Every structure is written in C-alpha cells, then in structure tokens.
Amino acid sequence: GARRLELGEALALGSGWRHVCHALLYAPDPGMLFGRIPLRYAILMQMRFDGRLGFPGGFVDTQDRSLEDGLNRELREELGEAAAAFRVERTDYRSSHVGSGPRVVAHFYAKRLTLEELLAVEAGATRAKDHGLEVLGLVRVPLYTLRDGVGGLPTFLENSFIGSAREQLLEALQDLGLL
Amino acid sequence: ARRLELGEALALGSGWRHVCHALLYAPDPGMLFGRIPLRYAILMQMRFDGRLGFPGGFVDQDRSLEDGLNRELREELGEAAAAFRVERTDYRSSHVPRVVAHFYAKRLTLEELLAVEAGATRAKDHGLEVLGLVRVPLYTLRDGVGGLPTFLENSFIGSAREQLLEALQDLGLL
Ligand SMILES: Nc1ncnc2c1ncn2[C@@H]1O[C@H](COP(=O)(O)OP(=O)(O)OC[C@H]2O[C@@H](O)[C@H](O)[C@@H]2O)[C@@H](O)[C@H]1O
Ligand SMILES: Nc1ncnc2c1ncn2[C@@H]1O[C@H](COP(=O)(O)OP(=O)(O)OC[C@H]2O[C@@H](O)[C@H](O)[C@@H]2O)[C@@H](O)[C@H]1O
Ligand SMILES: [Mg+2]
Ligand SMILES: [Mg+2]
Ligand SMILES: [Mg+2]
Ligand SMILES: [Mg+2]
C-alpha cells in the first residue's frame, strides 16, 4: 500500500508537492432492499472519467486558502450546488497517503449528512459542472452481502478504484459504523 | 453465453423466463478537457449486487418483449424513459437458470439522454435495485489504459460486457 502521512507532515512538504482531497459523504438509511436487507447507510462514490470508482474531490491549488476550501470547491464542481448546503471541515479529515503520481499527497475526509442532504446531492448531480466530463455518474456503495455470499459489497469491491479509494473506503467502513 | 436467433428464443417452454435490457445512447459532441471527443453518451447502471449492467428486466401480463422492456425501463429509470419507446427495430441479440437475455440498443438525442439521467433518482428502483447510472467512457487516455479499457475491468452482470462490446463495434460507436 501507499505510505501514510501525518497531516502536519504533509502540509510541511515543498511547493512542488500537489495535494488532492476527497470525501466520503454518507447518511443513515432506514430502507431495506427487497424489504429484508438493511441498507444501513447511503454512501456515495462516483464513476470517474478514467473508468474507475472514486470519491468526489480533486486537486487543491495555491488559490485555495486551505485543504478544506479546495475540497469544498471541488465538491461543488463535481456534485453541484446541493453540495453547498454543507461544509466538509478539518473535523471530517481522516487520512493522508502518498499518491502514485509525482509528489502527490491524497487527503481523505468522511462527512456525515442527513439523508435529505445526501438525497439532494444525488438529485442535482447531473447539473454539476463536471457531470458527463470528469464525473460519469454517482453510485451508492452496497453495504450488505447477498444470500449467495458474493453479491453486494464483496462484488462492489471487485470493481476498479482510483489510488487508495478502495483502502479509504474499507477503513471508513470499519472506523465509522459496524459496517 | 449461448447466442440464439429471436424466433428461436421465442419458441421455448414456460420453464423459460425472458429478460430484456437496453443500451441508451446519444451522440455527444462534447470533449473531455476540451480535447478528447466523447463521441457518445452511453448509459449503464450499478446494480444492487455491485455489478454494472443495462437497464431493463424480466418480461412477464406483458403483451410483448417490448411492452415488458419499456415497462421495466420506466420503473428503473423514471418518467423521462416514457419520452421514447424501445421497439423491435432496436433489437440486437438473444443469449441463454433457464433465462433468455434479449438486448436492445436505442438511439436518443443528448437532451433525451440527459433527461433520463436527471430524473433517475426519482425512479422506483433508485437506491434499492439500482444504485446509480454511469456513462461508459469510450476514449482511451494517453497512458493507454484509462477510459474504456479500465471501465471494462469493472464487474458486469450476465453478458452485459459482451453486449456492450458488440454494440460499440456494430453501431460503430468507436
Ligand atoms: N482516492 C484517492 N486516493 C489516492 N489518490 C487519488 C485518489 N483519487 C485521485 N487520486 C489521484 O489524484 C489525481 C487527481 O485526482 P482527481 O480527483 O482526478 O482530481 P481533479 O482535480 O478532480 O481532476 C483531475 C485532473 O487531472 C488531470 O489528469 C485531468 O486534467 C483532470 O482535470 C488522480 O489522477 C489520482 O492519481
Ligand atoms: N445484460 C444481461 N445479460 C444477461 N443476463 C442478465 C443481464 N442482466 C441481468 N441478467 C440476469 O437476468 C436476471 C435478472 O435481471 P434483472 O435486470 O435484475 O431483472 P429484474 O426484473 O430487474 O430483477 C429483479 C431482481 O430481484 C432479485 O431477487 C433478482 O436477483 C433479480 O435480479 C438475473 O439472473 C441476471 O443474472
Ligand atoms: Mg474535479
Ligand atoms: Mg476529482
Ligand atoms: Mg428491475
Ligand atoms: Mg435491472
């Protein structure tokens, strides 16, 4: 796996390093697939332009005052105006990893929404600036395993993921709920 | 999966069930990064089981394959799917539980396709049977792997990957 960095460590890296920020947006979901399988949470990912599943967010530049401003800017471009109903903050920060690209550090955040907030993000996503360009569409992460022992989560994890998105996902699944 | 003619597939026992699915596509003059022609917007969807597939479902009280296909498309995609009708002339192939999988490709305008994406979260199956729609990237990036080739490494239901690839070449979407 990619090297874990401390946040402070990462921010003290030279001007040549680029920082990228992504967020896992999630909300409790009381629904039940087929009326019997608890969904537990609605968690959003997206199909990226490169054919991989990822988390919304993107590069932070010099014109971004903080990691969190860059992140929220990128979420707005990628998810649309309903993203503005909330702010992902330093309290939502979970991890930093050395990126595979030359001198990239990947910061990961997890942000609890209400189901109504998450729903509004989904409903407006096709109006996002990057819908149909960087973002090919949003998908929810299935948290259940189906009665055949493979359908659902284990099969979702078999898709292609960008960077550390798979690891970032699994760690949040453990950390957060008993998912 | 075993290929068969439609007339062939239509003569089978009630033991046999029929499923229909559609690839909705529209020309897209856009360019990713202002540089990469997108060519077509093609819809696929992430299913409850964590696999990519095409919208559609089991034919059942359905007068024909087509009635069954559009009935299911509306349930999965929502009201904007009622703006058009997938017909026998959009038929592509049939493939053989004892289920036979019929595959259709239906051309829309970009605006009709966009309306489908825009209303899909409202659909009956959204958040349950369907986890969200995605477009199929048709370009290959400069690294020779990003885009379609990586897309095709994802998990697919049934014959979806093969039905995709046959449509991409036969309708000359590449
Ligand atoms: N979850 C992740 N974990 C680790 N690394 C990641 C993750 N997600 C992305 N990366 C890395 O960071 C890079 C940038 O992430 P994006 O989300 O794609 O950034 P964004 O600013 O939204 O746009 C990417 C830009 O890169 C150019 O290739 C292209 O012009 C595009 O505009 C990716 O190419 C990838 O290597
Ligand atoms: N593109 C495809 N090619 C071949 N087979 C397919 C394809 N898509 C689906 N199938 C198969 O057809 C069957 C059902 O397809 P769905 O699209 O899921 O049909 P729908 O009517 O929406 O089904 C309701 C769902 O309830 C679940 O209990 C059950 O697993 C079924 O998928 C499954 O056996 C699935 O493997
Ligand atoms: Mg971006
Ligand atoms: Mg991005
Ligand atoms: Mg269905
Ligand atoms: Mg279906």
- The distance of Cα B69 from the centroid of its chain, to the nearest Å, equals 11
Phi, psi of A113, deg, nearest 5: -105, 165
- The distance of Cα B8 from the centroid of its chain, to the nearest Å, equals 23
Phi, psi of A82, deg, nearest 5: -60, -15
Dihedral of CA B123/B127/B131/B133: which sign? positive
Nearest to B24 by CA among B88, B112, B95: B112
The best mutation among B19, B62, B104 to test binding of ligand 2, ranked by most ligand atoms within 8 Å of the C-beta, falls on B19
Structure tokens at A57: 């967010």
Structure tokens at A10: 């990462």
Phi, psi of A43, deg, nearest 5: -130, 130
What are the chain B neighbours of A80 within 8 Å (beta carbons)? none
Task: Map out the domains of chain B with their CATH numbers.
Answer: 1-174 (3.90.79.10)
The CA distance from A104 to A16, in Å, is 9
Binary contact (A132, B48; C-beta < 8 A): no
Residue ranges with CB less than 5 Å from ion ligand 6: B 57
SS3 assignment, position B127: coil
The CA distance from B74 to B57, in Å, is 11
- The distance of Cα A139 from the centroid of its chain, to the nearest Å, equals 11
Task: Please report the beta strands in chain B, taking only residues with DSSP state E, as ranges in sequence order.
Answer: 3-4, 17-32, 36-47, 52-53, 56-58, 91-95, 99-107, 130-135
- Chain B residues at the A interface, defined by Cβ less than 8 Å, are 28, 30, 32-33, 38, 41, 46, 48-52, 114, 117-118, 121-122, 127-129, 131-137, 141, 146-155
Q: Could you please report the per-residue DSSP string of chain A?
A: -PPEE-HHHHHTS-TT-EEEEEEEEEEEEEEEETTTEEEEEEEEEEEETTS-EE-SEEEE-TT-SSHHHHHHHHHHHHH-GGGGGS---GGGEEEEEE-SSTTEEEEEEEEE--HHHHHHHHHHGGGSTTBTTTEEEEEEPP-SB-TTSSTBHHHHTTS-B-TTHHHHHHHHHHHSS--
Angle at A80 between CA A76 and CA A84, to 5 degrees: 55
Beta bridge pairs of residue B156: B52
The CA distance from A75 to A88, in Å, is 9
Give first-to-last CA distance, chain A, whole Å.
Answer: 22
Structure tokens at B43: 């819809």
Beta bridge pairs of residue B108: none
Known binding residue A52? Answer is no
Q: Burial, A137: exposed, middle or buried (Cβ in 10 Å; 0-12, 13-18, 19+)?
A: buried
- Residue B43 is classified by DSSP as E
The CA distance from B75 to B128, in Å, is 12
The CA distance from B32 to B131, in Å, is 25
Query: Are B154 and B49 contacting, i.e. CB atoms less than 8 angstroms apart?
Result: no
Question: Measured in angstroms, how far is the CA atom of residue B128 from the centroid of ligand 3?
Answer: 28
Q: Resolution of the experimental model in angstroms, please?
A: 2.1
Query: Are B54 and B156 contacting, i.e. CB atoms less than 8 angstroms apart?
Result: no
